[PDB]
Every structure is written in structure tokens, then in C-alpha cells.
């Protein structure tokens, strides 16, 4: 019935409970599946024109099968951008790769009220590089 | 420094760490602010045409200030609709009322392919009903 | 020695650690077996004339074998009816169905004095509804 | 909004988060109020004609204001009686004392099926005796 | 080689992680083996001349192999005797019973001074009584 | 009501929750007062003729007022002496000149059966040395 | 006198429990002071010639007063450089900045042998940037 | 995937999760491998000329493979030396003849500012002595 971390990750299409990802903007995140359909990790935004680039912010969400959603609040020790984003989407095998198709909403303060900017990210699974040394 | 539950709730616009809400469809949810910008609670969906209606599903998200994001996976002990939804939005006063303006995304399995349906929910704060009795 | 969740669930008569139930009134609850004979879940009361209807309230109890007891306090973020109810009873097959035969007591505030109302609920196990989709 | 252990105990009518009690049969229990309306402790049954007399069994329940319910499974390391009892009731000041009026149901295995035996216990608060020595 | 609860209990000479015991005075206790050599449980003193008889008091201690030590502070919700006792000893076969042979020290306040009383309790293992009705 | 760590320490006659001690043989220990009468720490045995000397072994016990009991199992990652000891005793406080008078029992394997050796240690409180460099 | 997070951070010379830092190479880290002298956080290496650049790696360590030590294992979901680094050093005013002066050792596999590289990083405290829109 | 405690130890070259060590100066420590690359334990400093000798101080660090880093803050309940040290190094394993080659840095208060002393320790693994009595 209830999914373990590994089974939840396998049902999403990934071997490991920890998984590294990059999107089309070069933005990166780590996804960690846990108990009760949970998802945790960290997101680094490298999207052109976005404040709060280049440092990690925590993410939390939930998953079932190929489907996922997660949110990031743009708050950490380095920089706050007074906004939060949630992604929702699904996972598919796209060759020997694994991708995630998502759409996202970013809620933030505009000139006269709150606004919500929409977008779309496609994430690509990154194989853990076992380098064998820290030289080069 | 960092936001306590009461502080986080206050910053969002609500006097108490737990809060009940209802949207335009009669959908209901409870929101509980915790530490490190966390958000948890339960969602009961009463949206016309939606397949997992009437029972509570866990939600989890994050907040900062007036801004919020959260996710429900459509899986509990009563019913599974093989899908997840994420909401993102902001609080704002509408008189002595408090509302949450959100846009949402629902990722689910279509005929051949993953699909993302989109929409908007507005939530209105519901004061804890204080009866002296369970009799009518 | 001591009962694990799955073991405790099995001994009670149910194949899975989480289970959904409905009584004669359409009242619903979820039951989750844990360690040390524990029982937890949520109750939604739809009993005619009852003042805290339609929303979930936490329950907690204990089990051994076919036998169970649990309590709900009529307090959540939506509504408070200044009362608590305890159920006690046993599981028994009724064909391929599983039922819980319970008697209950509700302690509440009357006109001058604390009062205890009594009754009987029968619960019937509800199989997890497995849709491929949230669309209809 | 949410009650602390002390406030929950005060709302029940007792100074301390821990409280000792004796009923009309000389049965004894300890009540420990916790967070989220919780109640834990231990029950020793000295009721004429009951197996499982004279050792403590854990209790769990919930409370709001003067109202309480809690259950005991007749299982511990000393003796199992394959049954569980839940009490429900209310607290009142009865002179300088504090009492609890409860009714209870005991679910157990009868000769041809499950049965539920009802009863009534009145518990009296016992002041912690500070003896000042273990001699006499 | 770090011991599990079952392994620790088995090395002490009992089949199970929880065990019930009785000493020469009718005093009773429950022993629970944990991780890191740990021991917890509950003690009921029915020794002639001791205050603080007839109610359970937490115990805590450690074990290695056949050897054990544990302490009870004479403080619970019912009564405080402003004193503590420690037991130290060993398990041994006495026929097909299992016993624990122990010496004990009780520290308490005398007429002018701290004092330490000493003696020996021998404990015999009690099989869990499976009565399978609470009738008798 | 319940005793806090600081309160439990102050009652015992020491101004901090963590405290350092040495006995007549130069054996040393640290005592950490916690919730629920609890006591934990480490013991370093420098007693002539004892086999498990010079390394720290965990202790646990309980306290009330100026009374205390604790045990040490003679098992850690350096050496095992297949034995356990418990101390019971009382504190005697004049300012920062604080002593614990104790008696102890050592249970171990003799040549033909279990045996218990008795002894007395006097512990004296060591004021934390605040040296401001590791240099000499 | 046992230090709280805020007290520990203040003794190190930073206002807050979390802090962001940058070293002479553009490497970045986040420091989080906890209880029991503890330190945790995340490190991003942008040092010239180092593998495992540009992603966050957990750190952990301890502190007393102005003094700190911490370790990073070069392993995360993105990349493993089969090596670990520790930093040790002290905080000092440099103008109205706050710096940490540190020496470090990196242990890694060389052509035949374990090897240890050494150097110095100086870290400067970065104020949290409150941008209050994610635009730019 | 993620490394278990046992796996992390085996990778480091030691057969148990808890392990005892001694360096050239007779300083001793215990190393405990846990989840997430984590390392904890205690360090006893017997180095000539060092101010915080003969008592255990906590360590924490991280490991990957045969590489390790850990720090000790020179603060405990016996003595504070207002300084911290970190070791980094690698294990060298031939059967049960296992060594850790390390280098260390000691940060402390000099006469005019912070200073960092460097050194090298070689640790050698000590096989847990299984002595079967505390007697000699």
C-alpha cells in the first residue's frame, strides 16, 4: 500500500532516492524522495533575469507515480526575493534520459498588487559523476 | 533572524497558526504554519467534475510574507486519482476578510500522455465556529 | 513478542495498515495502526442532528486482536462542539466484507450539567478506490 | 488557539499536567495531558471479578475543556484479557475535590460472538502525597 | 558488536523484550530491553514497612550479558518518598524458572543525615498470562 | 509540578545541568540532569585493580532531591569487563564544596557463579576550569 | 554554561544563527549554529582547479567562542571527488566586515598514495540581500 | 546509493560501526559511523603540553571511502581551552592492522590575535578487549 522512499523514487522513474537535475536555463536541483509521498531537496536558480540566482533554496512537495509538485520560497541566508514558486508536472523516459515536464507559477509583489507569473521548465536527469579525485 | 509559526502566520495575514479556508467551489482546506517557512494541512476537494472529492488529502508547502505555495497528491486511504496539484498565490485583505488568490496546475495521465490542466482558486478565511454543544 | 503495524492490522481483520470506513449514517473515518497497540486517524461525522459535521477530527485509540477503542474530541480549525466521543467495539466478517460493531458515548455540556449520550455505530470497510485519473 | 499541556489540564480542572485518580472500585490511574488535546497514562484495574487486576496498562485519549475520553487495551507483559475498554465523561468540582463522571464500554469475546459490556466509574482526584521518607 | 533489544534480552536469558517479574516480597516489575544496553520499565513495591507501596514508579538502567543494574526514584503522581533505590545483580536458572539475584541500596533522608539502607531481592520471571476474556 | 533539568540540578546542589566529578580513587564522571528525574553521562574508572580503566562508559540513572542512583555497564568500544555497577547515594552541599556520598554494587562472573562486590565512593564536584588557551 | 544557537553565533561574532560567507576564490558557504557547540550548513567550491565545483555539499563542525572547525565530504547527488576537506580558524573584525581566517587540509587519493593538500581560505560575511521582488 | 553506517565503516576499513583508536601520544578516541557520511564520537587528549588532557570531548565530522575529517571543540564540563582542532586524513588498512594518517589544525588565542597551530597524528585501531571479568 504505502510507498517507501526507494519505491516512490522507482515509481517516478529514477533509481536512487537522491537525484540531481538540470533544466533548460541551467537551473539545478536535487530531489529526495521520502515517506508518505514526500519530496525534499534544494533548488539553484540560474534563470536569466531572476534575482536570487546561484544559491540553493529548499524545496518540499509530494509525488505519486510519474507526477510531482514542489515549491520553493525565495528565502535563504544569502538573498530573499519575497516570492514563492511551485512546479507541477510529470516524468518520462526520453531516450536513455529521464526528463520532467513541468509548469510553474511564481507569486510575487507587483507595483499595485500580488501577481503570478507562469512558465515552463523541462528538467533532465544528471548522472552522478564519480570523479575519483578532486584534481582538475 | 528566522520565522516562528505564529510569526509566519501573522506575516501571511492570519492571526493563528491553524486556519480553515473555503474556495469558490466549496473546496476546503486547513493550513498549519510551522518553522523554516513550512506549511502543512489537509485539503478536501469539492470541485465539479473532479474524481477524488469529499475526503481529505495531505498538503505541504512553503511561505514567505504574503506568498505561498503548496502541493496535494491525490492519494489517501479512500481514493487515488493518480495525479498531483500545486497551488501558488498570495494573501490579501478583502475588507475584514482575508483571501488567498491562487493559480494551480494539475498534472495527470491523459489518453496517451502526461497532461497539465491549469486554473485559478480564490480561498476565503473561515472563522473557527465555536458552539457550546454538538446538539441542534 | 509485540505487534507491528501490519501484524496489528491483520489481527484486527484488515490487510493494510491504513483503512477507510463508513458507518450507517455515512459518517467516515480512516484508521491507521501503529506500534504498541496504537491507533490513529481522522473522523468525518455526517450523523443527522450533529453539530460538527462534514470536516475531519483526529482520532486516537488502542487495539488488541479484533478489539478496538478510540476517541475524537470535537475540536478542529473549522468548528468546536465542546464535546468528545469514544467508540468501543469489535471487527467481524459479514461475508467478504469487514465491519466494526461499536457502541459509543458522547460527553457534552447540557442545560445545567455535563451529560453523556450513548448509541451504536456499525462501520463497513471501504476498498481504496483506484482511478487512473481525476477526470470524469 | 491550540492548548499547551498545562492549559489543557487547567481547562479540565486539575493544577498539574500529571494527576493521580481512584474510582469507586479502588481502581487507579494517572492522567498526563500533552499537546494537541492529547492524554496519556496508565490504568490499574482493581474491579471485583475482572481478570487483569493489579498491574498497569497504558491509556491514550483526548480531551477538550471538562470532557475526556480514553481507552485501555488489556495487554501488557503480565497479563492479556483480549479486550479493550473506553471511558468517556466530564470533570466537575464536587466540594474541594475534583471528580470525573464516566461511562465505559468493554469490548470482549463472548461465547458465540463479540460482546460489549457497559458500566459507570466515578473517579476522584488524589493529592500527591509528599511522604518525606520511605520509612513506614 | 552492538546488541539489539531481542539480542540483549536473550543474552540476559529471557525470550522477549518485555518481561514481568516478582520478588520474594510480592514486589513486581516490568523490564524492557532497548538499544545501547538500555533497560527501562516500571516497579511496584509491596515490601513490608516501605512507604510508596502499591503504585508504579519508572525504572531505568543498563545490562551486559547476564548482568544488570537499575534505579528507581520514589516519585510518581500518587506519592513521593524522597529517596532512590538501585538494584545490581545477575540472571540465573533456578530449575526451569529464570531468576535475577540482586543486592540493592536505598538512599533516603534520616533524622539528621543522608542514610543508605541495603538488602537483597531475588526476582522470578512470570509468564505472560493469556486469559482471552476479562471475565474472572 | 514536573522537575526541569536546571531545577533537578539545583535540587541536587549543583548550579549547572552538566557537572564534573572525581572520587577518592581519581575516577571521574560527568552527570547530566534532564527531564523526568533522568540522569545521564559518562564514567571514567581509575580504580586500582579494575580491568576497564581509562576510557569513558555511559551511565544512566534517576534523581530526586539530593538523592541519586546510576548504573554503568562495563561495555564500550575499547574494552568489555562483562559486568555492571550501580551507585546510590546523596549529595552534601556547602556552597561550591559539594560531595556525593555513595555505595555501589558490582555484579560480575565469579569462578562458579554470579557474584556481587560492594564498595563506597565519595565524589567531589570539580569546577569547570576555564583555561583560555590549550597552551602551557 | 551551555550555549544556545543565538548565543553561540553571537560569541562567534555574527548577529544571526544562519550566515552567508564568501572566500577569496568566490567559494561560498552557509553556517548554521546549533546546540551543543554544533555547526552545520552547505559549501559551494569555486576554487580554481578543483573538481566538484559549483554545487552544494553538506558541512558539519563545532565552535567555541571565536573559534571554529568544520568538514566537507566531497559527495552529493551531482558529483563525488572521493576526498574530504576540513577548515579550522577564527573570526575577526576586518574593518566593519566580519572575517573568518582559516587553514584547511584536503585528503584525497593520489597516484599511489593517500595525500594531504593544505592551504588557507579567508571568508567574509555577506549581508542577507532583501531584494523584495524576483525581478532582475 | 546512500551509504549505511556498516557500509561507511567497511569502506573506511573497519569491521564495526563503533571503533577505538590511539595515536602516537597515547591520545584516544572513539569513532562512530552513521547515516549521510556522518561521523561522531569522543576524543581524549593525552598530548604532552596540551591543557585539556585526560577527559572526553565530543567530535563530529564526515567521511567518504577511506577519507575522513573531524573536529573537536575543547569545551566540556571538566575544562575549556578556548580553542578547536580539526583532523583530516586517510585510512590505511591491512586486515585488522588499520591506521589513520592525519594532519590537524588547532585554532586558539595567541598573545596578540587568533593563531593556528599545525601538527600530524597517526591513529591506530584498537581491537575491543573482551576481558570477561573486571578482576585482575
PDB file of N, CA and C in Angstrom, chain F residues 13-90:
ATOM      1  N   UNK F  13      22.078  20.123  44.268  1.00  0.00           N
ATOM      2  CA  UNK F  13      23.039  21.042  44.933  1.00  0.00           C
ATOM      3  C   UNK F  13      24.143  21.524  44.002  1.00  0.00           C
ATOM      4  N   UNK F  14      23.901  21.506  42.693  1.00  0.00           N
ATOM      5  CA  UNK F  14      24.887  21.941  41.726  1.00  0.00           C
ATOM      6  C   UNK F  14      24.269  23.027  40.845  1.00  0.00           C
ATOM      7  N   UNK F  15      24.993  24.125  40.550  1.00  0.00           N
ATOM      8  CA  UNK F  15      24.445  25.222  39.746  1.00  0.00           C
ATOM      9  C   UNK F  15      24.296  25.018  38.225  1.00  0.00           C
ATOM     10  N   UNK F  16      24.935  24.022  37.621  1.00  0.00           N
ATOM     11  CA  UNK F  16      24.754  23.750  36.179  1.00  0.00           C
ATOM     12  C   UNK F  16      24.160  22.346  35.948  1.00  0.00           C
ATOM     13  N   UNK F  17      23.518  22.171  34.791  1.00  0.00           N
ATOM     14  CA  UNK F  17      22.856  20.954  34.379  1.00  0.00           C
ATOM     15  C   UNK F  17      23.869  19.812  34.104  1.00  0.00           C
ATOM     16  N   UNK F  18      25.036  20.171  33.538  1.00  0.00           N
ATOM     17  CA  UNK F  18      26.232  19.317  33.321  1.00  0.00           C
ATOM     18  C   UNK F  18      27.240  19.604  34.450  1.00  0.00           C
ATOM     19  N   UNK F  19      27.831  18.570  35.043  1.00  0.00           N
ATOM     20  CA  UNK F  19      28.731  18.737  36.198  1.00  0.00           C
ATOM     21  C   UNK F  19      29.785  17.626  36.189  1.00  0.00           C
ATOM     22  N   UNK F  20      31.004  17.999  36.579  1.00  0.00           N
ATOM     23  CA  UNK F  20      32.162  17.154  36.565  1.00  0.00           C
ATOM     24  C   UNK F  20      32.524  16.749  38.002  1.00  0.00           C
ATOM     25  N   UNK F  21      32.931  15.480  38.177  1.00  0.00           N
ATOM     26  CA  UNK F  21      33.166  14.885  39.494  1.00  0.00           C
ATOM     27  C   UNK F  21      34.373  13.960  39.463  1.00  0.00           C
ATOM     28  N   UNK F  22      34.988  13.798  40.646  1.00  0.00           N
ATOM     29  CA  UNK F  22      36.095  12.903  40.897  1.00  0.00           C
ATOM     30  C   UNK F  22      35.922  12.286  42.310  1.00  0.00           C
ATOM     31  N   UNK F  23      36.257  10.999  42.422  1.00  0.00           N
ATOM     32  CA  UNK F  23      36.160  10.265  43.644  1.00  0.00           C
ATOM     33  C   UNK F  23      37.566  10.058  44.234  1.00  0.00           C
ATOM     34  N   UNK F  24      37.615   9.285  45.324  1.00  0.00           N
ATOM     35  CA  UNK F  24      38.799   9.143  46.122  1.00  0.00           C
ATOM     36  C   UNK F  24      39.880   8.455  45.284  1.00  0.00           C
ATOM     37  N   UNK F  25      39.511   7.641  44.290  1.00  0.00           N
ATOM     38  CA  UNK F  25      40.460   6.833  43.534  1.00  0.00           C
ATOM     39  C   UNK F  25      40.929   7.590  42.275  1.00  0.00           C
ATOM     40  N   UNK F  26      40.435   8.819  42.096  1.00  0.00           N
ATOM     41  CA  UNK F  26      40.673   9.577  40.886  1.00  0.00           C
ATOM     42  C   UNK F  26      39.753   9.203  39.741  1.00  0.00           C
ATOM     43  N   UNK F  27      38.791   8.289  39.935  1.00  0.00           N
ATOM     44  CA  UNK F  27      37.793   8.017  38.904  1.00  0.00           C
ATOM     45  C   UNK F  27      37.003   9.298  38.671  1.00  0.00           C
ATOM     46  N   UNK F  28      36.520   9.495  37.447  1.00  0.00           N
ATOM     47  CA  UNK F  28      35.850  10.757  37.064  1.00  0.00           C
ATOM     48  C   UNK F  28      34.540  10.435  36.387  1.00  0.00           C
ATOM     49  N   UNK F  29      33.618  11.374  36.426  1.00  0.00           N
ATOM     50  CA  UNK F  29      32.404  11.193  35.695  1.00  0.00           C
ATOM     51  C   UNK F  29      31.813  12.555  35.434  1.00  0.00           C
ATOM     52  N   UNK F  30      30.941  12.584  34.454  1.00  0.00           N
ATOM     53  CA  UNK F  30      30.136  13.697  34.173  1.00  0.00           C
ATOM     54  C   UNK F  30      28.676  13.309  34.454  1.00  0.00           C
ATOM     55  N   UNK F  31      27.884  14.226  35.016  1.00  0.00           N
ATOM     56  CA  UNK F  31      26.491  13.978  35.327  1.00  0.00           C
ATOM     57  C   UNK F  31      25.642  14.992  34.574  1.00  0.00           C
ATOM     58  N   UNK F  32      24.672  14.521  33.779  1.00  0.00           N
ATOM     59  CA  UNK F  32      23.792  15.422  33.065  1.00  0.00           C
ATOM     60  C   UNK F  32      22.359  15.155  33.511  1.00  0.00           C
ATOM     61  N   UNK F  33      21.772  16.154  34.195  1.00  0.00           N
ATOM     62  CA  UNK F  33      20.333  16.170  34.617  1.00  0.00           C
ATOM     63  C   UNK F  33      19.425  16.560  33.446  1.00  0.00           C
ATOM     64  N   UNK F  34      18.355  15.773  33.261  1.00  0.00           N
ATOM     65  CA  UNK F  34      17.354  16.023  32.251  1.00  0.00           C
ATOM     66  C   UNK F  34      15.949  15.949  32.800  1.00  0.00           C
ATOM     67  N   UNK F  35      14.991  15.821  31.873  1.00  0.00           N
ATOM     68  CA  UNK F  35      13.570  15.739  32.214  1.00  0.00           C
ATOM     69  C   UNK F  35      13.263  14.428  32.958  1.00  0.00           C
ATOM     70  N   UNK F  36      12.171  14.440  33.722  1.00  0.00           N
ATOM     71  CA  UNK F  36      11.557  13.230  34.267  1.00  0.00           C
ATOM     72  C   UNK F  36      12.470  12.541  35.269  1.00  0.00           C
ATOM     73  N   UNK F  37      13.187  13.334  36.049  1.00  0.00           N
ATOM     74  CA  UNK F  37      14.060  12.794  37.108  1.00  0.00           C
ATOM     75  C   UNK F  37      15.321  12.136  36.516  1.00  0.00           C
ATOM     76  N   UNK F  38      15.566  12.297  35.212  1.00  0.00           N
ATOM     77  CA  UNK F  38      16.509  11.462  34.464  1.00  0.00           C
ATOM     78  C   UNK F  38      17.911  11.979  34.739  1.00  0.00           C
ATOM     79  N   UNK F  39      18.892  11.080  34.640  1.00  0.00           N
ATOM     80  CA  UNK F  39      20.304  11.393  34.786  1.00  0.00           C
ATOM     81  C   UNK F  39      21.071  10.582  33.746  1.00  0.00           C
ATOM     82  N   UNK F  40      21.980  11.236  32.998  1.00  0.00           N
ATOM     83  CA  UNK F  40      22.844  10.529  32.045  1.00  0.00           C
ATOM     84  C   UNK F  40      24.245  11.109  32.106  1.00  0.00           C
ATOM     85  N   UNK F  41      25.206  10.368  31.541  1.00  0.00           N
ATOM     86  CA  UNK F  41      26.562  10.881  31.327  1.00  0.00           C
ATOM     87  C   UNK F  41      27.562   9.773  31.044  1.00  0.00           C
ATOM     88  N   UNK F  42      28.808   9.989  31.497  1.00  0.00           N
ATOM     89  CA  UNK F  42      29.920   9.127  31.184  1.00  0.00           C
ATOM     90  C   UNK F  42      30.693   8.915  32.497  1.00  0.00           C
ATOM     91  N   UNK F  43      31.316   7.747  32.635  1.00  0.00           N
ATOM     92  CA  UNK F  43      32.124   7.435  33.777  1.00  0.00           C
ATOM     93  C   UNK F  43      33.508   6.916  33.349  1.00  0.00           C
ATOM     94  N   UNK F  44      34.573   7.444  33.956  1.00  0.00           N
ATOM     95  CA  UNK F  44      35.937   7.011  33.662  1.00  0.00           C
ATOM     96  C   UNK F  44      36.527   6.387  34.915  1.00  0.00           C
ATOM     97  N   UNK F  45      36.876   5.102  34.824  1.00  0.00           N
ATOM     98  CA  UNK F  45      37.195   4.333  36.051  1.00  0.00           C
ATOM     99  C   UNK F  45      38.713   4.345  36.249  1.00  0.00           C
ATOM    100  N   UNK F  46      39.232   4.909  37.352  1.00  0.00           N
ATOM    101  CA  UNK F  46      40.703   4.849  37.597  1.00  0.00           C
ATOM    102  C   UNK F  46      41.012   4.092  38.891  1.00  0.00           C
ATOM    103  N   UNK F  47      40.182   3.101  39.216  1.00  0.00           N
ATOM    104  CA  UNK F  47      40.263   2.400  40.460  1.00  0.00           C
ATOM    105  C   UNK F  47      41.329   1.311  40.378  1.00  0.00           C
ATOM    106  N   UNK F  48      42.251   1.228  41.355  1.00  0.00           N
ATOM    107  CA  UNK F  48      43.326   0.253  41.257  1.00  0.00           C
ATOM    108  C   UNK F  48      42.748  -1.162  41.208  1.00  0.00           C
ATOM    109  N   UNK F  49      43.241  -1.986  40.274  1.00  0.00           N
ATOM    110  CA  UNK F  49      42.854  -3.416  40.240  1.00  0.00           C
ATOM    111  C   UNK F  49      41.654  -3.681  39.323  1.00  0.00           C
ATOM    112  N   UNK F  50      41.016  -2.613  38.845  1.00  0.00           N
ATOM    113  CA  UNK F  50      39.852  -2.714  37.972  1.00  0.00           C
ATOM    114  C   UNK F  50      40.318  -2.802  36.509  1.00  0.00           C
ATOM    115  N   UNK F  51      39.698  -3.714  35.747  1.00  0.00           N
ATOM    116  CA  UNK F  51      40.061  -4.085  34.356  1.00  0.00           C
ATOM    117  C   UNK F  51      39.607  -3.125  33.241  1.00  0.00           C
ATOM    118  N   UNK F  52      38.684  -2.195  33.491  1.00  0.00           N
ATOM    119  CA  UNK F  52      38.115  -1.419  32.404  1.00  0.00           C
ATOM    120  C   UNK F  52      38.409   0.046  32.718  1.00  0.00           C
ATOM    121  N   UNK F  53      39.697   0.328  32.935  1.00  0.00           N
ATOM    122  CA  UNK F  53      40.191   1.633  33.370  1.00  0.00           C
ATOM    123  C   UNK F  53      40.546   2.518  32.172  1.00  0.00           C
ATOM    124  N   UNK F  54      40.429   3.848  32.352  1.00  0.00           N
ATOM    125  CA  UNK F  54      40.952   4.903  31.497  1.00  0.00           C
ATOM    126  C   UNK F  54      40.091   5.322  30.315  1.00  0.00           C
ATOM    127  N   UNK F  55      38.927   4.695  30.099  1.00  0.00           N
ATOM    128  CA  UNK F  55      38.052   5.067  28.984  1.00  0.00           C
ATOM    129  C   UNK F  55      36.639   5.324  29.490  1.00  0.00           C
ATOM    130  N   UNK F  56      35.875   6.177  28.785  1.00  0.00           N
ATOM    131  CA  UNK F  56      34.539   6.547  29.218  1.00  0.00           C
ATOM    132  C   UNK F  56      33.502   5.484  28.861  1.00  0.00           C
ATOM    133  N   UNK F  57      32.657   5.178  29.860  1.00  0.00           N
ATOM    134  CA  UNK F  57      31.498   4.317  29.735  1.00  0.00           C
ATOM    135  C   UNK F  57      30.237   5.082  30.103  1.00  0.00           C
ATOM    136  N   UNK F  58      29.131   4.885  29.361  1.00  0.00           N
ATOM    137  CA  UNK F  58      27.906   5.638  29.623  1.00  0.00           C
ATOM    138  C   UNK F  58      27.309   5.298  30.996  1.00  0.00           C
ATOM    139  N   UNK F  59      26.703   6.283  31.659  1.00  0.00           N
ATOM    140  CA  UNK F  59      25.835   5.998  32.786  1.00  0.00           C
ATOM    141  C   UNK F  59      24.431   6.557  32.527  1.00  0.00           C
ATOM    142  N   UNK F  60      23.433   5.963  33.195  1.00  0.00           N
ATOM    143  CA  UNK F  60      22.039   6.446  33.291  1.00  0.00           C
ATOM    144  C   UNK F  60      21.557   6.192  34.708  1.00  0.00           C
ATOM    145  N   UNK F  61      20.721   7.085  35.230  1.00  0.00           N
ATOM    146  CA  UNK F  61      20.006   6.832  36.444  1.00  0.00           C
ATOM    147  C   UNK F  61      18.904   7.840  36.664  1.00  0.00           C
ATOM    148  N   UNK F  62      18.514   7.997  37.927  1.00  0.00           N
ATOM    149  CA  UNK F  62      17.453   8.916  38.291  1.00  0.00           C
ATOM    150  C   UNK F  62      17.835   9.562  39.602  1.00  0.00           C
ATOM    151  N   UNK F  63      17.150  10.659  39.877  1.00  0.00           N
ATOM    152  CA  UNK F  63      17.414  11.514  40.991  1.00  0.00           C
ATOM    153  C   UNK F  63      16.071  12.026  41.469  1.00  0.00           C
ATOM    154  N   UNK F  64      16.012  12.304  42.763  1.00  0.00           N
ATOM    155  CA  UNK F  64      15.059  13.178  43.360  1.00  0.00           C
ATOM    156  C   UNK F  64      15.744  13.892  44.528  1.00  0.00           C
ATOM    157  N   UNK F  65      15.593  15.210  44.553  1.00  0.00           N
ATOM    158  CA  UNK F  65      16.166  15.999  45.618  1.00  0.00           C
ATOM    159  C   UNK F  65      17.678  15.836  45.618  1.00  0.00           C
ATOM    160  N   UNK F  66      18.248  15.516  46.779  1.00  0.00           N
ATOM    161  CA  UNK F  66      19.689  15.343  46.851  1.00  0.00           C
ATOM    162  C   UNK F  66      20.042  13.852  46.741  1.00  0.00           C
ATOM    163  N   UNK F  67      19.090  13.033  46.296  1.00  0.00           N
ATOM    164  CA  UNK F  67      19.311  11.600  46.151  1.00  0.00           C
ATOM    165  C   UNK F  67      19.484  11.201  44.671  1.00  0.00           C
ATOM    166  N   UNK F  68      20.293  10.174  44.450  1.00  0.00           N
ATOM    167  CA  UNK F  68      20.651   9.758  43.146  1.00  0.00           C
ATOM    168  C   UNK F  68      21.034   8.281  43.154  1.00  0.00           C
ATOM    169  N   UNK F  69      20.783   7.645  42.009  1.00  0.00           N
ATOM    170  CA  UNK F  69      21.206   6.295  41.664  1.00  0.00           C
ATOM    171  C   UNK F  69      21.595   6.265  40.196  1.00  0.00           C
ATOM    172  N   UNK F  70      22.660   5.535  39.840  1.00  0.00           N
ATOM    173  CA  UNK F  70      23.018   5.393  38.416  1.00  0.00           C
ATOM    174  C   UNK F  70      23.759   4.091  38.122  1.00  0.00           C
ATOM    175  N   UNK F  71      23.593   3.569  36.911  1.00  0.00           N
ATOM    176  CA  UNK F  71      24.380   2.455  36.607  1.00  0.00           C
ATOM    177  C   UNK F  71      25.281   2.668  35.382  1.00  0.00           C
ATOM    178  N   UNK F  72      26.403   1.922  35.429  1.00  0.00           N
ATOM    179  CA  UNK F  72      27.315   1.784  34.353  1.00  0.00           C
ATOM    180  C   UNK F  72      27.469   0.315  33.964  1.00  0.00           C
ATOM    181  N   UNK F  73      27.166   0.012  32.697  1.00  0.00           N
ATOM    182  CA  UNK F  73      27.542  -1.256  32.096  1.00  0.00           C
ATOM    183  C   UNK F  73      28.972  -1.138  31.576  1.00  0.00           C
ATOM    184  N   UNK F  74      29.836  -2.146  31.843  1.00  0.00           N
ATOM    185  CA  UNK F  74      31.293  -2.060  31.529  1.00  0.00           C
ATOM    186  C   UNK F  74      31.513  -2.623  30.132  1.00  0.00           C
ATOM    187  N   UNK F  75      30.816  -1.993  29.176  1.00  0.00           N
ATOM    188  CA  UNK F  75      30.886  -2.256  27.777  1.00  0.00           C
ATOM    189  C   UNK F  75      31.028  -0.922  27.021  1.00  0.00           C
ATOM    190  N   UNK F  76      32.099  -0.796  26.219  1.00  0.00           N
ATOM    191  CA  UNK F  76      32.249   0.261  25.198  1.00  0.00           C
ATOM    192  C   UNK F  76      33.172  -0.244  24.091  1.00  0.00           C
ATOM    193  N   UNK F  77      33.565   0.648  23.182  1.00  0.00           N
ATOM    194  CA  UNK F  77      34.267   0.216  22.003  1.00  0.00           C
ATOM    195  C   UNK F  77      35.736  -0.128  22.310  1.00  0.00           C
ATOM    196  N   UNK F  78      36.275   0.272  23.462  1.00  0.00           N
ATOM    197  CA  UNK F  78      37.644  -0.069  23.839  1.00  0.00           C
ATOM    198  C   UNK F  78      37.738  -1.402  24.581  1.00  0.00           C
ATOM    199  N   UNK F  79      36.857  -1.646  25.572  1.00  0.00           N
ATOM    200  CA  UNK F  79      37.004  -2.866  26.415  1.00  0.00           C
ATOM    201  C   UNK F  79      35.692  -3.197  27.100  1.00  0.00           C
ATOM    202  N   UNK F  80      35.449  -4.497  27.209  1.00  0.00           N
ATOM    203  CA  UNK F  80      34.278  -5.040  27.873  1.00  0.00           C
ATOM    204  C   UNK F  80      34.731  -5.862  29.087  1.00  0.00           C
ATOM    205  N   UNK F  81      34.161  -5.601  30.289  1.00  0.00           N
ATOM    206  CA  UNK F  81      34.506  -6.361  31.550  1.00  0.00           C
ATOM    207  C   UNK F  81      33.332  -7.194  32.080  1.00  0.00           C
ATOM    208  N   UNK F  82      32.328  -7.360  31.228  1.00  0.00           N
ATOM    209  CA  UNK F  82      31.288  -8.367  31.431  1.00  0.00           C
ATOM    210  C   UNK F  82      30.736  -8.249  32.851  1.00  0.00           C
ATOM    211  N   UNK F  83      30.260  -7.052  33.164  1.00  0.00           N
ATOM    212  CA  UNK F  83      29.887  -6.744  34.489  1.00  0.00           C
ATOM    213  C   UNK F  83      29.169  -5.405  34.467  1.00  0.00           C
ATOM    214  N   UNK F  84      28.387  -5.075  35.519  1.00  0.00           N
ATOM    215  CA  UNK F  84      27.777  -3.730  35.695  1.00  0.00           C
ATOM    216  C   UNK F  84      27.798  -3.347  37.173  1.00  0.00           C
ATOM    217  N   UNK F  85      27.817  -2.038  37.398  1.00  0.00           N
ATOM    218  CA  UNK F  85      27.882  -1.428  38.677  1.00  0.00           C
ATOM    219  C   UNK F  85      26.764  -0.377  38.796  1.00  0.00           C
ATOM    220  N   UNK F  86      26.169  -0.271  39.989  1.00  0.00           N
ATOM    221  CA  UNK F  86      25.249   0.803  40.266  1.00  0.00           C
ATOM    222  C   UNK F  86      25.692   1.460  41.550  1.00  0.00           C
ATOM    223  N   UNK F  87      25.582   2.784  41.579  1.00  0.00           N
ATOM    224  CA  UNK F  87      25.856   3.642  42.698  1.00  0.00           C
ATOM    225  C   UNK F  87      24.523   4.220  43.176  1.00  0.00           C
ATOM    226  N   UNK F  88      24.369   4.340  44.502  1.00  0.00           N
ATOM    227  CA  UNK F  88      23.254   5.051  45.078  1.00  0.00           C
ATOM    228  C   UNK F  88      23.724   5.908  46.243  1.00  0.00           C
ATOM    229  N   UNK F  89      23.177   7.105  46.380  1.00  0.00           N
ATOM    230  CA  UNK F  89      23.797   7.964  47.389  1.00  0.00           C
ATOM    231  C   UNK F  89      23.144   9.307  47.451  1.00  0.00           C
ATOM    232  N   UNK F  90      23.786  10.247  48.148  1.00  0.00           N
ATOM    233  CA  UNK F  90      23.188  11.546  48.404  1.00  0.00           C
ATOM    234  C   UNK F  90      24.251  12.619  48.345  1.00  0.00           C
TER     235      UNK F  90
END
